Design an enzyme around this catalytic site. Structure first.
Site, mmCIF file in Angstrom:
data_model
loop_
_atom_site.group_PDB
_atom_site.id
_atom_site.type_symbol
_atom_site.label_atom_id
_atom_site.label_comp_id
_atom_site.label_asym_id
_atom_site.label_seq_id
_atom_site.Cartn_x
_atom_site.Cartn_y
_atom_site.Cartn_z
ATOM 1 N N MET A 51 -4.952 -21.800 11.166
ATOM 2 C CA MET A 51 -6.143 -21.102 10.655
ATOM 3 C C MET A 51 -7.384 -21.982 10.841
ATOM 4 O O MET A 51 -7.943 -22.553 9.900
ATOM 5 C CB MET A 51 -5.914 -20.724 9.202
ATOM 6 C CG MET A 51 -4.769 -19.771 9.057
ATOM 7 S SD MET A 51 -4.532 -19.231 7.364
ATOM 8 C CE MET A 51 -3.926 -20.675 6.697
ATOM 9 N N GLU B 215 -0.475 -19.161 0.530
ATOM 10 C CA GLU B 215 -1.747 -19.878 0.455
ATOM 11 C C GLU B 215 -1.883 -20.536 -0.917
ATOM 12 O O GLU B 215 -2.462 -19.935 -1.824
ATOM 13 C CB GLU B 215 -2.927 -18.895 0.746
ATOM 14 C CG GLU B 215 -2.786 -18.276 2.159
ATOM 15 C CD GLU B 215 -3.896 -17.321 2.526
ATOM 16 O OE1 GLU B 215 -3.879 -16.824 3.676
ATOM 17 O OE2 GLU B 215 -4.758 -17.055 1.675
ATOM 18 N N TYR B 216 -1.381 -21.770 -1.100
ATOM 19 C CA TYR B 216 -0.661 -22.644 -0.149
ATOM 20 C C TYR B 216 0.379 -23.403 -0.962
ATOM 21 O O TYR B 216 0.148 -23.656 -2.149
ATOM 22 C CB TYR B 216 -1.608 -23.651 0.513
ATOM 23 C CG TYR B 216 -2.704 -22.976 1.284
ATOM 24 C CD1 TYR B 216 -3.885 -22.598 0.669
ATOM 25 C CD2 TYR B 216 -2.518 -22.642 2.616
ATOM 26 C CE1 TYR B 216 -4.887 -21.938 1.385
ATOM 27 C CE2 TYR B 216 -3.499 -21.985 3.330
ATOM 28 C CZ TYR B 216 -4.674 -21.633 2.711
ATOM 29 O OH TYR B 216 -5.651 -20.963 3.439
ATOM 30 N N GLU C 158 0.838 -1.189 0.000
ATOM 31 C CA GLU C 158 0.000 0.000 0.000
ATOM 32 C C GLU C 158 0.876 1.244 0.000
ATOM 33 O O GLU C 158 1.988 1.237 0.542
ATOM 34 C CB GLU C 158 -0.953 0.042 1.219
ATOM 35 C CG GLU C 158 -2.061 -1.007 1.152
ATOM 36 C CD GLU C 158 -3.134 -0.695 0.119
ATOM 37 O OE1 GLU C 158 -3.302 0.485 -0.273
ATOM 38 O OE2 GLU C 158 -3.824 -1.654 -0.284
ATOM 39 N N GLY D 200 2.461 -12.605 1.891
ATOM 40 C CA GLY D 200 1.619 -13.502 1.137
ATOM 41 C C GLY D 200 0.156 -13.130 1.211
ATOM 42 O O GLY D 200 -0.232 -11.999 0.894
ATOM 43 N N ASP E 221 -12.939 -21.172 8.464
ATOM 44 C CA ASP E 221 -13.277 -21.440 7.057
ATOM 45 C C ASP E 221 -13.546 -22.922 6.810
ATOM 46 O O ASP E 221 -13.281 -23.428 5.711
ATOM 47 C CB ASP E 221 -12.186 -20.949 6.094
ATOM 48 C CG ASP E 221 -11.814 -19.507 6.302
ATOM 49 O OD1 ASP E 221 -12.715 -18.685 6.588
ATOM 50 O OD2 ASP E 221 -10.605 -19.173 6.198
#
Ligand code: BV0
Ligand code: BV0
Length: 364
Positions: A189, A119-120, A49, A76, A192
């Site tokens: 994680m 990922e991943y 950014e 990532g 999800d």
């Protein structure tokens, strides 16, 4: 114990009171803050950014108020993709270029470590060779961080990774026993598990299975994911249990079946601030008017529905239950995705600042 919290550098673009900048961070809330995300240019760490250099300074400046606090930079994430990781790990020259650039980059901006968020490896178009090359990358980073500490006399740079819960991704990309040796901690994680890619409702982050679930579906829950990473050789003290401050939403096929496992036709309506169909921030669900909230008894987590909208999410009670679980397993702490999805400024839920993450802080 650790409380590891992710900051996201695109939350600054959210509208109204959902806008999140480093000034919205509480320096005492978490033990480790992770900045998502850095990118990669010609195999070298880079910003993503326009104002990252300024935000880095503000982010790591929080340590002036809390010298115990550790910060890391995550490389990532989903949008980054896999090709640039694949090309960088492909040769020893390219890994050395990356590792040297990471050390200089982290030291320049006063980060205490690096969090790997590929990922991943082995999935999403990354080839099967990337499983062992990820192991080599982790070894390369760990070795170089150890060497840099002797030359700088600073505290050794930390190395962590965000890792998937799904066994398919784990076996396609992760030599669990080998990488866990070289990682300071492992950010699981544990969410999800279900979402609007599925044809029926299910919870984003259930702690246990439902009784109707059997076989591989009985592994789509936090407990199964924790057991997998422990069994495969992660020391409990290194396993950090991820918890979501968001939920996953569905459009019901009919308002006449509202159960877990009810037919769904796609994502739930996008939230007014997060604007992404299929997910909602905690602060977008906590104050739904005219809705019905219920707990999934077996799975220890809530869902809420109104008309044809159905959302599985985590609340203060489910966070308390999951911390009780992680303590019983002797895990190293909790991780949270993400700071800006909690009610970070108490503007929606009338529970004060950071009601979900402060719950973790109190219980840990
Ligand atoms: C399509 C998809 C398929 C399979 C896996 N996927 C992800 O594993 C994923 C992760 C993220 C993510 O942000 N990880 C950050 C993060 C970092 C560290 C800790 N915890 C979280 C993501 N944004 N998407 C795409 C959005 C948009 C649509 C659905 O979900 C993702 N998609 C997919
Ligand atoms: C973890 C995860 C995080 C964020 C998003 N995620 C997906 O958006 C996703 C989709 C699918 C999927 O089937 N997309 C096809 C499809 C697409 C659109 C409509 N309808 C169907 C999926 N299988 N996973 C889990 C993986 C894990 C291993 C086996 O598969 C998924 N995971 C995630």
């Amino acid at each position: 114990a650790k409380l590891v919290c992710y900051f996201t550098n695109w939350a600054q673009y959210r509208q109204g009171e959902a806008r999140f900048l480093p000034k919205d961070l509480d320096p005492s809330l978490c033990t480790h803050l992770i900045y998502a995300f850095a990118g990669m240019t010609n195999h070298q760490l880079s910003t993503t950014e326009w104002n990252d250099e300024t935000l880095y300074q503000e982010f790591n400046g929080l340590k002036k108020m809390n010298p115990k606090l550790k910060t890391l930079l995550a490389i990532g994430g989903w949008n980054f993709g896999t090709q640039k990781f694949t090309d960088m790990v492909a040769t020893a020259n390219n890994r050395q270029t990356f590792v040297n650039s990471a050390i200089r980059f982290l030291r320049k901006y006063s980060f205490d470590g690096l969090d790997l968020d590929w990922e991943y490896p082995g999935s999403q178009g990354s080839p099967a060779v990337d499983k062992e090359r990820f192991t080599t990358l982790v070894q390369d980073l760990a070795n170089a961080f150890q060497q840099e500490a002797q030359t700088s006399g600073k505290e050794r740079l930390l190395l962590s990774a965000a890792v998937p819960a799904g066994q398919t991704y784990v076996d396609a990309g992760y030599e669990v026993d080998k990488i866990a040796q070289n990682l300071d901690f492992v950010n699981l994680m544990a969410y999800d598990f279900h979402g609007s890619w599925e044809k029926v409702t299910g919870h984003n982050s259930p702690l246990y299975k439902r009784q109707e679930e059997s076989g591989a579906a009985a592994s789509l829950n936090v407990d199964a994911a924790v057991q997998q990473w422990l069994q495969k050789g992660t020391p409990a003290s290194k396993l950090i249990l991820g918890m979501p401050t968001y939920g996953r939403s569905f459009t019901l096929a009919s308002s006449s079946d509202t159960r877990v496992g009810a037919p769904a036709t796609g994502s739930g309506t996008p939230g007014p601030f997060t604007k992404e169909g299929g997910m909602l921030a905690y602060y977008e669900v906590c104050s739904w008017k005219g809705a019905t909230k219920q707990r999934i008894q077996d799975q220890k987590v809530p869902y809420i529905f109104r008309d044809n909208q159905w959302v599985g999410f985590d609340d203060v009670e489910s966070f308390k239950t999951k911390v009780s679980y992680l303590k019983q397993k002797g895990l190293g702490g909790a991780m949270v995705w993400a700071l800006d999805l909690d009610d970070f400024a108490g503007f929606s839920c009338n529970q004060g600042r950071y009601p979900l993450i402060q719950t973790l802080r109190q219980e840990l």
